[PDB]
Scaffold this motif. Sequence first.
Motif, PDB file in Angstrom:
ATOM      1  N   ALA A   1       0.823  -1.200   0.000  1.00 10.88           N
ATOM      2  CA  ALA A   1       0.000   0.000   0.000  1.00 10.88           C
ATOM      3  C   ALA A   1       0.868   1.267   0.000  1.00 10.88           C
ATOM      4  CB  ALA A   1      -0.919  -0.014   1.209  1.00 10.88           C
ATOM      5  N   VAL A   2       2.086   1.156   0.532  1.00  9.38           N
ATOM      6  CA  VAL A   2       3.030   2.260   0.601  1.00  9.38           C
ATOM      7  C   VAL A   2       4.408   1.830   0.112  1.00  9.38           C
ATOM      8  CG1 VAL A   2       4.306   3.839   2.100  1.00  9.38           C
ATOM      9  CG2 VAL A   2       1.877   3.352   2.524  1.00  9.38           C
ATOM     10  N   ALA A   3       4.967   2.595  -0.822  1.00  7.51           N
ATOM     11  CA  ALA A   3       6.280   2.315  -1.390  1.00  7.51           C
ATOM     12  C   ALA A   3       7.058   3.620  -1.561  1.00  7.51           C
ATOM     13  CB  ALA A   3       6.125   1.634  -2.728  1.00  7.51           C
ATOM     14  N   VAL A   4       8.366   3.549  -1.324  1.00  6.66           N
ATOM     15  CA  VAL A   4       9.257   4.697  -1.430  1.00  6.66           C
ATOM     16  C   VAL A   4      10.453   4.341  -2.305  1.00  6.66           C
ATOM     17  CG1 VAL A   4      10.730   6.377  -0.218  1.00  6.66           C
ATOM     18  CG2 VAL A   4       8.668   5.445   0.921  1.00  6.66           C
ATOM     19  N   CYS A   5      10.955   5.328  -3.028  1.00 12.94           N
ATOM     20  CA  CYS A   5      12.079   5.125  -3.905  1.00 12.94           C
ATOM     21  C   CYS A   5      12.851   6.421  -3.884  1.00 12.94           C
ATOM     22  CB  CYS A   5      11.607   4.833  -5.335  1.00 12.94           C
ATOM     23  SG  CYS A   5      10.799   6.232  -6.187  1.00 12.94           S
ATOM     24  N   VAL A   6      14.051   6.388  -4.445  1.00 12.17           N
ATOM     25  CA  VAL A   6      14.896   7.555  -4.489  1.00 12.17           C
ATOM     26  C   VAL A   6      15.335   7.724  -5.920  1.00 12.17           C
ATOM     27  CG1 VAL A   6      17.098   8.517  -3.747  1.00 12.17           C
ATOM     28  CG2 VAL A   6      15.693   7.234  -2.149  1.00 12.17           C
ATOM     29  N   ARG A   7      15.517   8.968  -6.340  1.00  7.56           N
ATOM     30  CA  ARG A   7      15.989   9.252  -7.684  1.00  7.56           C
ATOM     31  C   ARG A   7      17.160  10.163  -7.460  1.00  7.56           C
ATOM     32  NH1 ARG A   7      13.020  11.664 -13.223  1.00  7.56           N
ATOM     33  NH2 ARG A   7      14.830  11.194 -14.533  1.00  7.56           N
ATOM     34  N   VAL A   8      18.261   9.887  -8.137  1.00 12.75           N
ATOM     35  CA  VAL A   8      19.449  10.698  -7.959  1.00 12.75           C
ATOM     36  C   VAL A   8      19.646  11.601  -9.158  1.00 12.75           C
ATOM     37  CG1 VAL A   8      21.871  10.637  -7.395  1.00 12.75           C
ATOM     38  CG2 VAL A   8      20.387   8.713  -6.774  1.00 12.75           C
ATOM     39  N   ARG A   9      19.821  12.890  -8.900  1.00 14.24           N
ATOM     40  CA  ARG A   9      20.033  13.847  -9.984  1.00 14.24           C
ATOM     41  C   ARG A   9      21.412  13.593 -10.600  1.00 14.24           C
ATOM     42  NH1 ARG A   9      20.768  20.556  -9.715  1.00 14.24           N
ATOM     43  NH2 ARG A   9      20.963  20.828 -11.984  1.00 14.24           N
ATOM     44  N   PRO A  10      21.482  13.493 -11.934  1.00 13.83           N
ATOM     45  CA  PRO A  10      22.765  13.257 -12.611  1.00 13.83           C
ATOM     46  C   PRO A  10      23.720  14.424 -12.360  1.00 13.83           C
ATOM     47  CG  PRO A  10      20.919  13.016 -14.137  1.00 13.83           C
ATOM     48  CD  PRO A  10      20.355  13.575 -12.878  1.00 13.83           C
ATOM     49  N   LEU A  11      25.016  14.173 -12.491  1.00 13.03           N
ATOM     50  CA  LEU A  11      26.010  15.218 -12.304  1.00 13.03           C
ATOM     51  C   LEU A  11      26.304  15.867 -13.659  1.00 13.03           C
ATOM     52  CD1 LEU A  11      28.661  13.822  -9.785  1.00 13.03           C
ATOM     53  CD2 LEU A  11      26.830  15.479  -9.439  1.00 13.03           C
ATOM     54  N   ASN A  12      26.368  17.196 -13.688  1.00 12.49           N
ATOM     55  CA  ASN A  12      26.645  17.927 -14.931  1.00 12.49           C
ATOM     56  C   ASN A  12      28.161  17.879 -15.209  1.00 12.49           C
ATOM     57  OD1 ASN A  12      24.108  18.855 -13.781  1.00 12.49           O
ATOM     58  ND2 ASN A  12      24.951  20.882 -13.284  1.00 12.49           N
ATOM     59  N   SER A  13      28.857  16.939 -14.584  1.00 13.68           N
ATOM     60  CA  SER A  13      30.353  16.941 -14.547  1.00 13.68           C
ATOM     61  C   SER A  13      30.915  15.570 -14.038  1.00 13.68           C
ATOM     62  CB  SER A  13      30.648  17.844 -13.401  1.00 13.68           C
ATOM     63  OG  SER A  13      29.789  17.333 -12.334  1.00 13.68           O
TER      64      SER A  13
ATOM     65  N   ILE B   1      17.278  13.429  -4.870  1.00 14.49           N
ATOM     66  CA  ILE B   1      18.504  13.791  -4.166  1.00 14.49           C
ATOM     67  C   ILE B   1      19.638  14.181  -5.118  1.00 14.49           C
ATOM     68  CG2 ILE B   1      20.376  12.178  -3.598  1.00 14.49           C
ATOM     69  CD1 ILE B   1      17.303  13.131  -1.429  1.00 14.49           C
ATOM     70  N   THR B   2      20.556  15.009  -4.628  1.00 15.22           N
ATOM     71  CA  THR B   2      21.709  15.429  -5.417  1.00 15.22           C
ATOM     72  C   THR B   2      22.979  15.044  -4.637  1.00 15.22           C
ATOM     73  OG1 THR B   2      22.748  17.286  -6.598  1.00 15.22           O
ATOM     74  CG2 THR B   2      21.836  17.744  -4.432  1.00 15.22           C
ATOM     75  N   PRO B   3      23.804  14.160  -5.219  1.00 15.20           N
ATOM     76  CA  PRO B   3      25.060  13.637  -4.663  1.00 15.20           C
ATOM     77  C   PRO B   3      25.994  14.650  -4.012  1.00 15.20           C
ATOM     78  CG  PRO B   3      24.559  12.535  -6.694  1.00 15.20           C
ATOM     79  CD  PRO B   3      23.659  13.746  -6.627  1.00 15.20           C
ATOM     80  N   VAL B   4      26.116  15.813  -4.633  1.00  8.95           N
ATOM     81  CA  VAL B   4      27.007  16.851  -4.143  1.00  8.95           C
ATOM     82  C   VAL B   4      26.549  17.514  -2.853  1.00  8.95           C
ATOM     83  CG1 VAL B   4      27.579  17.263  -6.529  1.00  8.95           C
ATOM     84  CG2 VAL B   4      25.904  18.717  -5.363  1.00  8.95           C
ATOM     85  N   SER B   5      25.370  17.139  -2.378  1.00  8.27           N
ATOM     86  CA  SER B   5      24.845  17.716  -1.147  1.00  8.27           C
ATOM     87  C   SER B   5      24.993  16.716  -0.021  1.00  8.27           C
ATOM     88  CB  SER B   5      23.367  18.074  -1.323  1.00  8.27           C
ATOM     89  OG  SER B   5      22.701  18.127  -0.073  1.00  8.27           O
TER      90      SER B   5
END
Length: 322
Positions: free
Chosen positions: A3-15, A291-295
Amino acid sequence: EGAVAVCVRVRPLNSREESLGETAQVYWKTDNNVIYQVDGSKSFNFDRVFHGNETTKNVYEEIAAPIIDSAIQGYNGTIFAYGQTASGKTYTMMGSEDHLGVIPRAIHDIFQKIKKFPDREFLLRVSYMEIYNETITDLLCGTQKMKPLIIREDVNRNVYVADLTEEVVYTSEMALKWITKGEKSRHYGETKMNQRSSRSHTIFRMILESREKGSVKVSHLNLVDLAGSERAARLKEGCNINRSLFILGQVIKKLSDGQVGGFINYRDSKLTRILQNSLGGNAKTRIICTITPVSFDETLTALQFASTAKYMKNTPYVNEVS
Ligand SMILES: Nc1ncnc2c1ncn2[C@@H]1O[C@H](COP(=O)(O)OP(=O)(O)O)[C@@H](O)[C@H]1O
Ligand SMILES: O=S(=O)(O)CCN1CCN(CCS(=O)(=O)O)CC1
Ligand SMILES: [Mg+2]
């Protein structure tokens, strides 16, 4: 169940070479379905982590499509985009013409899938509202800015915004025309005090109704783009809290911990009162945490919140009215 599911998406690096001259820092990495920090001991487990290479289409097809199908069957479904400003929330939820977000994809998908059901009849209407500084403004209007959250749906006492514009649509073209307007009419706002975007929540809702050739299936599909979580959260003035984001997390924690009945403060915020049924109620809820890796600090805060949401319990069922 699920009934409830969570996932994460990581923003690609411009570098991997860039800003702070010859480099800023990458504090997180994801392997298989786990996200851990570079040089540290914190790690997180999710039943799905999309990496910078995976497309919005894939996020939609794996996460959202099943919610749409469920919506067509009479199940309430809600989907949130949560995370730090510039982590990809709007990119994932609204996107561009080149890379359509979850909202437009859901619309196209819904209109294409109801056709696979000739025995029944379909009724669809859309709404679009914005929540900023505790105040609820209608994005398809003419000027009563602030509406109230009434409860008179004495059929289980469902919540609703004191008659907010609900537009009947027969084509996806029209649906998207309302979005476009709503998007536009977002800036006859902006300079009340700007970047109000990163500081407000937006809810696109679609009410679906259907019947054959006596009982009507009715489902609410909410698609949420929340405010920046850097302002989510013992403390003195060292940041700038957003009431709704704070109450959101507070309500999620309690539910994951086992509280119910009235120990859950849904009323301390408009967001949580409006989206009350989506937090431990009669709906299939999914959370996409960008989410963004650099943070580091921001990412950590969002991951903790995303992680805590995995344990929330909802009890969904088909909604047919006699
Ligand atoms: N997964 C992605 N792939 C390519 N570009 C992205 C992705 N996610 C975000 N971006 C880009 O990063 C920037 C941050 O965008 P945005 O979605 O507006 O952040 P947020 O809405 O969370 O504040 C935008 O220019 C956007 O197009
Ligand atoms: O700025 S934000 O909009 O993000 C959140 C602030 N806002 C303050 C007022 N409450 C509701 C009171 S009540 O309407 O339930 O009495 C909702 C949240
Ligand atoms: Mg945004």
